[PDB]
Amino acid sequence: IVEGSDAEIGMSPWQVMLFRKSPQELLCGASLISDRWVLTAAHCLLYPPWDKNFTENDLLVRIGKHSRTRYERNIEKISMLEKIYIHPRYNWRENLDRDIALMKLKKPVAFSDYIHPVCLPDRETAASLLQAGYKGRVTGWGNLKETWTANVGKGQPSVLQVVNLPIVERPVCKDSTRIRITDNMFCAGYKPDEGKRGDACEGDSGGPFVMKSPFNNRWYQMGIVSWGEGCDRDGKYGFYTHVFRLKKWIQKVIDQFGE
Amino acid sequence: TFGSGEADCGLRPLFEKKSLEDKTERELLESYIDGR
Numbered sequence A: 001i002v003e004g005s006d007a008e009i010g011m012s013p014w015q016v017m018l019f020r021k022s023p024q025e026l027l028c029g030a031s032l033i034s035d036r037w038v039l040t041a042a043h044c045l046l047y048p049p050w051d052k053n054f055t056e057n058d059l060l061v062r063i064g065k066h067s068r069t070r071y072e073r074n075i076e077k078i079s080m081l082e083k084i085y086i087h088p089r090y091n092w093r094e095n096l097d098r099d100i101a102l103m104k105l106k107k108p109v110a111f112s113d114y115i116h117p118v119c120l121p122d123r124e125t126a127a128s129l130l131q132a133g134y135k136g137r138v139t140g141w142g143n144l145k146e147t148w149t150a151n152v153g154k155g156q157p158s159v160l161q162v163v164n165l166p167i168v169e170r171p172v173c174k175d176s177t178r179i180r181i182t183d184n185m186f187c188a189g190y191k192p193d194e195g196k197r198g199d200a201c202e203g204d205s206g207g208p209f210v211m212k213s214p215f216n217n218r219w220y221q222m223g224i225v226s227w228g229e230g231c232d233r234d235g236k237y238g239f240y241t242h243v244f245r246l247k248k249w250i251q252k253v254i255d256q257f258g259e
Numbered sequence B: 001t002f003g004s005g006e007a008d009c010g011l012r013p014l015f016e017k018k019s020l021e022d023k024t025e026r027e028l029l030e031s032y033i034d035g036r
């Protein structure tokens, strides 16, 4: 993440890491929304211009960790997937619209001090909390700068990191990019004059952007880290998938299988 | 269908439950109408 801090132990229990089986490499982050369900950005799985097109048997998920690397011995759980669901209207080609994806674990996970769901937002928690100026929190392992060229400082960080970012208002977003923004996307991060830095960066795609609800003291996944022109550029803002505006789809696919 | 921690979700075992407030949480909430 650019310009952020170490995470605390237990600070982000819904944080999954989408890991690649062979070879071992880290693909993105993701989030734990249930005992069996993990939510990520679609482009972490299907992105044609990059011959990144994965399927169950390629991904391996790892819940509950802090270190980017260390095995974390009776802390973190590796598991594997049963199926994958991409929003079937994902526009990878023009503007990454609708970058969402549901992934179904083969076997449900045991919650813990370190492993716990985040909540999906509801109408009235969307309305109150997604507003200009309000900060949210973004999480990830994932580069420390623009290693777009190899670069000026830290690399990829040893341990999960955090950052708090204010949401921006729509025109400012609309006007910072040539790319056509859509209603399924909000931005966030500082304004060149506001005098702070910090943003998601490559490796963070798919992770959650969360906020904390002052009405019930609960954590909420408001958005998924989706895209950006770069990392931390003055006067560019990061784009996040509006989870709430997509909620019915999330509902429909979990009310497919069960018990 | 469930099987879904929509239930005791968003509650971190190690903070809220344990009645604790992480290092920077305060900021989040402090921005909710500039006001905490």
Ligand SMILES: *C(=O)[C@H](CC(=O)C=C(C)C)[C@@H]1[C@@H](O)C[C@]2(C)C3=CC[C@@H]4[C@](C)(CC[C@@H](OC(C)=O)[C@@]4(C)C(=O)O)[C@H]3CC[C@@]12C
Pocket: A028, A043, A044, A142, A199, A200, A201, A202, A203, A204, A205, A206, A225, A226, A227, A228, A229, A230, A231, A232, A238, A239
């Ligand atoms: C995920 O880690 C990362 C998202 C990210 O970095 C988020 C923020 C910064 C807020 C993803 C990667 O998985 C790949 C990614 C989708 C992209 C790849 C190519 C570019 C993007 C589509 C953005 C537009 C354009 O960017 C340019 C012009 O510099 C690309 C087509 C490009 O570089 O060629 C990009 C978006 C997010 C991205 C880095």
